[PDB]
């Protein structure tokens, strides 16, 4: 569980 790319 990856973070969000716009972050």
């Amino acid at each position, epitope marked *: *569980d*990856v*973070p*969000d*790319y*716009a*972050s």
Partner: antibody
Framework: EVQLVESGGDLVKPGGSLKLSCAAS????????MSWVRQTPDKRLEWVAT????????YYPDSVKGRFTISRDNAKNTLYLQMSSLKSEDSAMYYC?????????????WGQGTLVTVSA | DIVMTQSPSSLTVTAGEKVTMSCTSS????????????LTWYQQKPGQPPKVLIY???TRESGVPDRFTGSGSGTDFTLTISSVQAEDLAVYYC?????????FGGGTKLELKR
């Protein structure tokens, strides 16, 4: 076919609570993050929350920070948003939209919208 | 936050003619690593949710018609429709999709010359 159908929108007293649901289909729900994106009556579009694919990361605008919470159920294919302490500025069409974790190409998949009205 | 700006608000068009819409972020939407701008253009016709038209500023999505092209980098972006047809009278939004908070412009809304 990716299907994201929302439910829950209603008339709410300001300073109340409401909990919407977004039920996704035609994809593996858990590999993608999601967002709630709302539309006001002046057709102003704004982002509300993002939750990553395993619910371990959540993101909020200051408007909504500490008043709403995005959460998911990966087993039941359902995404949620608990609104609390509802002001009248939050009356809007609430859309669930997928975050495109693989393509990184914007909000490709949107739902139908559900409408909240916060009015005394 | 990266505030987005769209000009014009309305645009009067004649069908068959080229029309240009501009978008402006307050901060460069340029992803140095991936080497692309993370700016998306949306089209919403009434009743519908928005629709993805161009992403990565210039990459036209699948099934979107040829007449639509995205241009610009850094802070200035431009959408072109080159034979505006009658089914383009919609509202067009640009979106910062580089840094959360994600921000949407106000829209430019096409109306027809008469």
């Amino acid at each position: 076919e990716v299907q994201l159908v929302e439910s829950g929108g209603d008339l709410v007293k300001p300073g109340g609570s409401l909990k919407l649901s977004c039920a996704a289909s035609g994809f593996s729900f858990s590999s993608y993050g999601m967002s709630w994106v709302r539309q006001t009556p002046d057709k102003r579009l704004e982002w509300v929350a993002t939750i990553s694919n395993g619910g371990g990361y959540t993101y909020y605008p200051d408007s909504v920070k500490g008043r709403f919470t995005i959460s998911r159920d990966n087993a039941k294919n359902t995404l949620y948003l608990q609104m609390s302490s509802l002001k009248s500025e939050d009356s809007a069409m609430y859309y669930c939209a997928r975050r495109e974790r693989y393509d990184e190409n914007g909000f490709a998949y949107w739902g139908q919208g559900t409408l909240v009205t916060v009015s005394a | 936050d990266i505030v987005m700006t769209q000009s014009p608000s309305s645009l009067t068009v004649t069908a068959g003619e080229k029309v240009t819409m501009s978008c402006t972020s307050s901060q460069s939407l340029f992803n140095s690593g991936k080497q692309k701008n993370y700016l998306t253009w949306y089209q919403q016709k009434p009743g519908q949710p928005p629709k993805v038209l161009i992403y990565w500023a210039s990459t036209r999505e699948s099934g979107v018609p040829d007449r639509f092209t995205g241009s610009g980098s850094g802070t200035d972006f431009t959408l072109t429709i080159s034979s505006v047809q009658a089914e383009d009278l919609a509202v067009y939004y640009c979106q910062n999709d580089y840094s959360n908070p994600l921000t949407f412009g106000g829209g430019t809304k096409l109306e027809l010359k008469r």
